[PDB]
Amino acid sequence: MAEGEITTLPALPEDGGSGAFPPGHFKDPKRLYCKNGGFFLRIHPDGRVDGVREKSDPHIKLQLQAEERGVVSIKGVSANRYLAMKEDGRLLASKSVTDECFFFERLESNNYNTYRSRKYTSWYVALKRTGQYKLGSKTGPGQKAILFLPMSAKS
Secondary structure, eight states: OOOSSSSOOOOOOSOOSSOSSSSSSTTSOEEEEETTTTEEEEEOTTSOEEEESOTTOTTOOEEEEEETTTEEEEEESSSOOEEEEOSSSOEEEESSOOSTTBEEEEEOSSSOEEEEESTTTTOBOOBOSSSOBOOTTTOOTTOGGGOEEEEEOOO
16 A cells, blocks of 8 residues: 555645745655656666656655756755766766756646756757666657656645
8 A cells, every 4th residue: 555655646735826936846855757658767876867667766756956047956865966967968967066967947838847958958858768868869859758747745
């Protein structure tokens, strides 16, 4: 019965209350659930970024934070490392947060979200269909792998 994380997850608290983009829900971690192939993102301790269906993996607990305006700093709790994109397309994590760790979160009207790379706005973060990280060069429009659905771990 406990098959899951903690506290009933099926729920939609705060239906709105005027407030969705500004700070107001970045106090608790958020599970990044990808709609393409239904896969959750998970930063391995080795920095290798991948994805797994096990929604119980206590490693999927990524600590996200808001910064400036529209930008968001991602951080790993167990991995204790900040996500960072490379120049060729290899995605990995590190202990120090460099300017190559931000991601513009463009929320669309489909309740979904798209994390675009900053140092390289010519690509977006998207996984494949086996939990592998799609190269930053093979990523682009057309693929729905950019539709993310971060669920806040409130209740």
